[PDB]
Write a protein that binds this ligand. Structure first.
Ligand SMILES: *[C@@H]1O[C@H](CO)[C@@H](O[C@@H]2O[C@H](CO)[C@@H](O[C@@H]3O[C@H](CO)[C@@H](O)[C@H](O)[C@@H]3O)[C@H](O)[C@H]2NC(C)=O)[C@H](O)[C@H]1NC(C)=O
Ligand code: NAG
Lengths: 54, 235, 277
């Protein structure tokens, strides 16, 4: 994965190239996890998804 | 919005309506944050005063859960011209912090570089609203949604006979009766990426409705993000 | 002298249905010829229903004494259930504090062979409309302007609805210099439904370039509900027979369409600020 242009650079949220290296970055209500692919929610109603309760 | 299919509950939660003194909607808006509303510039002129309504799946009658809020201040781009319909972006600061619940949730604004690299290079996108059901017919009382693909730049400019600015881009079918009509001013356009939803454009303009060999023009939001950012801390 | 209010147009070969004079302060009315009224502080309504086979043509009201107010910017006479062409309608008039008399007359014509096309079409259809005001264009684009000295109303942006002497109006599109007049079509009251349509020809040099509709109707309250007159599908060159479809919320009683023809029209013509949602 040289650039984030290929499948979001394996990230499930924001991606960019820092020091010519693919690095992820999350949106509000999220933070980068151990693997960094998926950002775990950190809020009651995180954005980016449709609500599903009942 | 002609044709398509009615939005199912829990799939279109980022919408909001603008109501006049008679309490009838005429423009839409996107819930960007707890105080922030995105709307087209031209919606600010036909109404002297207005309020915001949220959480209504049926404009004809109340069903419970709807909320009414009062506007505080409006900000508009300094280069808006009524002739070319350019810079059709407007931000609204509200008063009461909206209470998030089911069917009421904001859509996060994505970064510009990703959006131009991947999001805008995808196949299709989703629009929604309360658009009229014909060229001059009646307005629908049920929120509706529809799907539309993108169009290449060369055909985009060759389609219409008017001038096209770099701040807005076209899309739409060729002959099938799938296109949004009047009454959807300020409506949001969203893109899907691994089930994640990102706002990309606003329904800006376009002559006629479902005309043969004609495309609709949507305002390109990705090039205004810094402006949007400079409005994140205004009042 | 006294002020006057009209509904319809008068012709020199019509017989009177009835003719009466009313005071406007008594309570209740005087029952004239077994009819019914109602009088209040700000309303005067009358019920009419003829017995002979006839279709009504015109109504006229005269009020004394003269008062300082023009009589064309608002609505003062309107009848609520019926109209022109149907043998009955219920008149409603709104008074002021200084009006104390009224004179009322009604004219009609034999029911079977009565049609109103010979009056509202005029003698020079290419230069004067049914209202009487002549057309006047813009010299740099050749598109007609909007007459401004009549009661006009809008529903949303980019819409117009004129009114005068109980006759409405709606112009479909814009008009050019070199248009021609082809013909006119009329629709009587026995072919009126809640939803209907009409077929017109578009063969070669009969290309439709302008349509304006004139119609009477009823109104429950002073605020009317204009019907939806949209243009079914698209009338391009290919489809020769083109249909016009109505969608009414209240029942009309008469309609009239003045087709205009221009071979040069490409089918699309719109202003530079009308176009975007
Ligand atoms: C003096 O009399 C006039 C009529 O001669 C009154 O105007 C009419 O009043 C009636 C009764 O309120 C109205 O009917 C109402 O209409 C609603 C509309 O939804 C409907 O639910 C019912 O049919 C209801 O009865 C009527 O609209 C109104 N206007 C007319 C007939 O043109 C007037 O109100 C009277 N004056 C006073 C001070 O009451
Ligand atoms: C235009 O042609 C199409 C062809 O299918 C037809 O369905 C439509 O009714 C036509 N419209 C008019 C106004 O004639």
């Amino acid at each position: 994965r040289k650039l984030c242009s290929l499948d979001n650079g394996d990230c499930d949220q924001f991606c960019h190239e820092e020091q010519n290296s693919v690095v992820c970055s999350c949106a509000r209500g999220y933070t980068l996890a151990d693997n960094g692919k998926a950002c775990i929610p950190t809020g009651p109603y995180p954005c980016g998804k449709q609500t599903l309760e009942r | 919005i002609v044709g398509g299919q009615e939005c199912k509950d829990g799939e279109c939660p980022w919408q909001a309506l603008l109501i006049n003194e008679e309490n009838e909607g005429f423009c839409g808006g996107t819930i960007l944050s707890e105080f922030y509303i995105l709307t087209a510039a031209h919606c600010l002129y036909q109404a002297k005063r207005f309020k915001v309504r949220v959480g209504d799946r049926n404009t004809e009658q109340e069903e419970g859960g709807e909320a009414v809020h009062e506007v505080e201040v409006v900000i508009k781009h300094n280069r808006f011209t009524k002739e070319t319909y350019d810079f059709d972006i407007a931000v609204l600061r509200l008063k009461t912090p909206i209470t998030f619940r089911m069917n009421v949730a904001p859509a996060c604004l994505p970064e510009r570089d990703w959006a131009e690299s991947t999001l805008m290079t995808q196949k299709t996108g989703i629009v929604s609203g309360f658009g009229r059901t014909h060229e001059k017919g009646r307005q629908s009382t049920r929120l509706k949604m529809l799907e539309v693909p993108y169009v290449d730049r060369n055909s985009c400019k060759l389609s219409s006979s008017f001038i096209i600015t770099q701040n807005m881009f076209c899309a739409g079918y060729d002959t099938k009766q799938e296109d949004a009509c009047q009454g959807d001013s300020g409506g949001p356009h969203v893109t899907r990426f691994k089930d994640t939803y990102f706002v990309t454009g606003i329904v800006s303009w376009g002559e006629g409705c479902a005309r043969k060999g004609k495309y609709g023009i949507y305002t390109k939001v990705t090039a205004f993000l810094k402006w949007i950012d400079r409005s994140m801390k205004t009042r | 002298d006294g002020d006057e209010y009209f509904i319809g147009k008068y012709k020199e070969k019509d017989e009177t249905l009835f003719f009466a004079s009313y005071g406007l302060k008594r309570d209740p009315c005087q029952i004239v010829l077994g009819y019914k009224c109602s009088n209040n502080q700000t309303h005067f309504v009358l019920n009419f229903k003829t017995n002979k086979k006839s279709c009504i043509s015109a109504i006229k009201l005269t009020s004394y004494p003269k008062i300082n107010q023009n009589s064309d910017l608002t609505r003062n006479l309107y009848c609520q259930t019926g109209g022109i062409g149907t043998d009955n309608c219920k008149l409603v008039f709104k008074k002021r504090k200084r009006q104390i008399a009224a004179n009322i007359e009604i004219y009609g014509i034999p029911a079977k062979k009565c049609s109103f096309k010979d009056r509202y079409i005029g003698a020079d259809p290419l230069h004067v409309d049914s209202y009487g005001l002549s057309y006047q264009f813009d010299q740099e684009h050749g598109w007609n302007l909007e007459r401004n000295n009549i009661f006009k109303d809008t529903r949303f942006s980019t819409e117009v609805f004129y009114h005068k002497n109980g006759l409405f109006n709606t112009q479909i599109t814009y008009l050019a210099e070199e248009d021609s007049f082809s013909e006119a079509r009329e629709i009587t009251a026995k072919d009126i439904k809640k939803k209907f349509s009409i077929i017109l020809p578009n063969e070669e040099y009969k290309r439709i370039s302008f349509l304006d509709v004139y119609w009477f109707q009823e109104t429950m309250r002073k605020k009317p509900k204009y019907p939806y007159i949209h243009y079914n599908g698209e009338c391009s060159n290919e489809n020769k027979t083109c249909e016009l479809v109505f969608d009414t919320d209240e029942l009309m009683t008469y309609a009239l369409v003045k087709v205009f023809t221009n071979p040069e029209s490409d089918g699309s013509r719109l202003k530079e600020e009308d176009l975007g949602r």
